[PDB]
Design a protein around this ligand. Structure first.
Ligand SMILES: Nc1ncnc2cc(-c3cccc(S(=O)(=O)NC(=O)[C@@H]4CCCN4)c3)cc(F)c12
Ligand SMILES: Nc1ncnc2cc(-c3cccc(S(=O)(=O)NC(=O)[C@@H]4CCCN4)c3)cc(F)c12
Lengths: 572, 568
């Protein structure tokens, strides 16, 4: 019973290299860890499954230590539950819907809030049972429009999803903080450089959601940190405050200027030799009040934050931009020619805009701008709000330090749900005093298969994968030279048995001479095995084995009599 | 602490079999919809214990664990032909791009696709891949709780070989691994021969948990190793010779005589002197074949289909087809003046002076004798065995038992590799279509099967390997500080020594009687009761799940005592 390369290192051919463009995808294919079945659907090959199980074990251990109870819920779920929550329609096209042979309707679960709520309303009948936290490690399906980046944006993927139930907000906060702490322990034990960040929870301010990110150059998410405080937020959530302390004095009188073929900030800047920080962008969106429009204004060098925009009560959520036809009907001028002066719709300006002076804006007259605009003198200041994305070097909104923007891969997300589900689905328990209480809920998700890829995105070199110690699929590769020779065979097999008996996970390279030593060595490093031992006649003659670490440049001789001492020391 | 206030969800017209009843009542599972169940905390613990044992034995047999997707592209199923052929149990769907998929009921096509990409050298063979993975089968009437669900957990393995001998070695290894699995799960089980789709041969076996509720009949020789499911079990006659003709054949009017019972009762004939004639579709398009068994016997539809002359799968001729071919209807058929091909059962060949429908409506021949009145047709084994029949290997007699199928193994030949073009060059450079086996265990079914076999009036009896916890701590008044500290200490010591402990932490509103009944329902094999009185006398109160009476252990020797009980 040896684990052998002839079995574990399968063919990686009929893989078009154009098809893998991020390093984790390339290396998971080349290392024989995953194989594509179809768009966003991958098999875990024997080597890759070993890594997945190590992630799952650590996640389960830390969920258990935090007092959560493991369950396992079905993938296929009745549409009727999804209609109770409203997500049957609202979830959108990522929900995979189907019908069974009796014409009954179902989805494949992308997540399990409705199922666990249905469970709770049947299983939780007393306050003495609360608080409680249920979790599973289970395969989800989300019909991502363009599955890509290997495991990072698959359609079928493994999630640890937990759901907690409470009679009060304070109770929820306690579990939520416990889940945050458990996540920190998980990503620490997985040997990943990671950060928790504040995330959007569907309103201005507050702290009802956090994300956990693996730091990596390829990460799709912008995450924001103070260089001096513990402030940390994804860019959707990060609060923007102005660099300026006050509004500058007006130095220019307002004038109406002809600006043909001037429909972008760049054209205005280049065309009229304006600093970009003296220009504004006026974006028109649908109002929450049906049939109304709202103008949202940011400085010309800033971007509208669509989450912040939507979260304004006056602005419809989700965010909908006005069409050119709607804008022209409302204002009598088109995109490129809009601004706050003589604007016949409501307006909200960014904090930085409120402090601008002598600024340029579309005149709400086609192909004209006002220059030298000043608040109060030329028009009243409208409502002010935080509307923009932060940018590198902005002030930290807690007043401590300046902001830096890094890239992250989202591997965890936790949420406070209040009574969103318990109200919709009638989940209530009587308090100790005998009052009906709609249960207050949290939910907590880790992208378990994503974590595997994220680890590689963060940890790789020119020779292939670098695993954190907790993730390596094997600890030791034995590379016998001439394993067919009786002396090498028996010494190699003896070494395998001694190491395995000490609890080490060992892979034996049993491949014949058509695989050169050089290829074998490169294979073991590509897969990311942290240690190798080479066995040869020459070494045995001198009573040595040849050792090399994955992160060592040179091999070293290992006296056979110090095997366990030497190797135990390396694996600590 | 693992505590009852969290775990215990112990508390139904749809629940008719005992395992289903008890899994609900013990808070192990909860129904979401038809054939869809959630594993509750206590139940999941049992499932994981099954999975661990299965994984251990698969790994020891040299199989490599993988994990394949549930959603599978239709194109692979079209290659094998099972996109259509699997039938309505295949759950078919379309994604947002209108591409077609199924949810996997099994994974032959996916693993074959993997193999044609991953296996390119004879040096890689033989190889055996397996997964423990949730399947979906759209069972027309999901029932029996976990036994016939729609979503269920299967361990499925698939082996690849360059020769039949190589397959046989792995197949035998899987058979042996299965034996170890069900032995370690503490189940009383038997392996049996199963249908392979031809007469004779040994390319399929099933593993059954013996249980009174078992849907499957399985057959054993009392004196030999012979073991087969009823589909597969070979039938041989009890008689050694055909009797001499003592009666002349004669045509008899027999109105309202369309069953064996009407003929036996109506005309006072022994049932062993009557025959049933069943008309089925021939393999040759548009033809019919008559299959004949003795009146006390039943046609085995697997044996019938496996006859080369008979279309497979088996299709029975309609009344209209029968009337058109023969000129009489069901109830009036037989082998005399029969204008279609006929095959008779081994037992029928030995009959004499027998009665048969005349192939004339409402008439029978009596006094029929082979050779004299008509030629003997082809003879075959067509009937089901019955209790007390001769063992077909000549050694002993057969007994029939009821089984729950929990495992099934198959030799597939090149069925998939030919259709999907899976081939590897031999050492000689000749392309070889890979010869395949597959091996399945119904992991979630096993949990229910265990209870079907092992239960009593107080609830579940788990095999030691399956029990969700080893010890229940039942403090009588846990609010009492002396009790709380002693119990908590006990929990810590026990847990520290590696034992799995449930602490009943529930308040006074739950009587000690209910606590005891709950721990027995859920099947925990050992309890320790902690009372202040007991602690004052330096004694704890122990009881095994299968014991009649509790006993008083000295508070000091509990650890040695418990350790011994759990060291077997
Ligand atoms: N395509 C994809 N491929 C691979 N891994 C993916 C992982 C996620 C993922 C992971 C963690 C949390 C979330 S979430 O933020 O959506 N939150 C919830 O689902 C909540 C918490 C748990 C109960 N419901 C999504 C999403 C994807 F799309 C993936
Ligand atoms: N409804 C149901 N509920 C719960 N458990 C069920 C279990 C099975 C089951 C178990 C073992 C083998 C088989 S099989 O004989 O079909 N063989 C194959 O699938 C082969 C071997 C493995 C690769 N393919 C079916 C079938 C069901 F329908 C179930």
């Amino acid at each position: 019973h040896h684990m052998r390369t002839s079995q574990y290192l399968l063919s990686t051919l009929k893989e078009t290299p154009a098809d893998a463009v991020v390093i984790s995808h390339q290396l998971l294919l080349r290392a024989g860890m995953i194989r594509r079945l179809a768009s966003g659907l991958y098999t875990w090959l024997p080597m890759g499954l070993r890594v997945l199980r190590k992630v799952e074990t650590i996640v389960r251990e830390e969920m258990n230590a935090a007092g959560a109870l493991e369950v396992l819920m079905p993938a296929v779920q009745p549409a009727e539950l999804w209609q109770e929550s409203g997500r049957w329609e609202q979830y959108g096209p990522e929900l995979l819907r189907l019908k069974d042979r009796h014409e009954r309707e179902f989805c494949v679960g992308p997540t399990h809030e409705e199922v666990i709520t249905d469970l709770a309303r049947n299983e939780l009948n007393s306050y003495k049972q609360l608080p409680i936290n249920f979790y599973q490690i289970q395969t989800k399906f989300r019909d991502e429009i363009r599955p890509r980046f290997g495991l990072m944006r698959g359609r079928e993927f493994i999630m640890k999803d937990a759901y907690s139930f409470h009679l009060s907000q304070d109770s929820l906060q306690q579990t939520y903080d416990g889940m945050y702490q458990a996540y920190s322990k998980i990503f620490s034990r997985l040997g990943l450089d990671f950060r928790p960040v504040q995330a959007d929870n569907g309103s201005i301010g507050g702290s009802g959601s956090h994300e956990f990110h693996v730091l990596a150059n390829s990460g799709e998410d912008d995450i924001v940190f103070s260089d001096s405080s513990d402030y940390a937020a994804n860019i959707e959530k990060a609060e923007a405050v102005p660099r300026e302390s006050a509004r500058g004095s007006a130095t220019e009188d307002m004038r109406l200027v002809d600006t043909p073929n001037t429909k972008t900030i760049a054209a205005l800047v280049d065309g009229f030799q304006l600093p970009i920080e003296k220009t504004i962008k006026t974006l028109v969106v649908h109002g929450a009040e049906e049939g109304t429009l709202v103008a949202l204004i940011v400085r010309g060098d800033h971007e509208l934050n669509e989450i912040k925009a939507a979260n304004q009560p006056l602005v419809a959520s989700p965010l909908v931009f006005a069409s050119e036809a709607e804008i022209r009907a409302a204002i009598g001028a088109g995109p490129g020619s809009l601004g706050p002066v003589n604007l016949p719709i409501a307006c909200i300006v960014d904090r930085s805009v409120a402090l601008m002076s002598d600024f340029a804006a579309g005149a709400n007259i086609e192909d004209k701008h006002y220059f030298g605009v000043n608040w109060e003198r030329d028009l009243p200041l409208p409502e002010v709000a935080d509307l923009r994305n932060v940018v590198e070097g902005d002030p930290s909104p807690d007043g401590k330090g300046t902001l830096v923007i890094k890239r992250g891969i989202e591997v965890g997300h936790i949420f406070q749900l209040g009574t969103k589900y318990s109200e919709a689905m009638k989940l209530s328990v009587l308090s100790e005093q005998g009052k009906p209480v709609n249960l207050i809920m949290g939910c907590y998700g880790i992208g378990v298969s994503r974590v595997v890829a994220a680890a590689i995105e963060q940890n790789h070199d020119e020779r292939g994968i670098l695993w954190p110690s907790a993730l390596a699929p094997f600890q030791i590769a034995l590379v016998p030279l001439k394993y067919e020779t009786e002396s090498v065979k028996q010494a190699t097999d003896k070494l395998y048995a001694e190491l395995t008996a000490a609890g080490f996970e060992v892979l034996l390279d049993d491949r014949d001479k058509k695989t050169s030593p050089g290829v074998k060595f490169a294979d073991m490093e590509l897969i990311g095995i942290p240690h190798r031992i080479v066995i040869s006649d020459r070494g045995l003659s001198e009573g040595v084995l040849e050792y090399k670490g994955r992160r060592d440049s040179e091999s070293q001789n290992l006296p056979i009599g110090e095997l366990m001492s030497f190797i135990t020391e390396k694996l600590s």
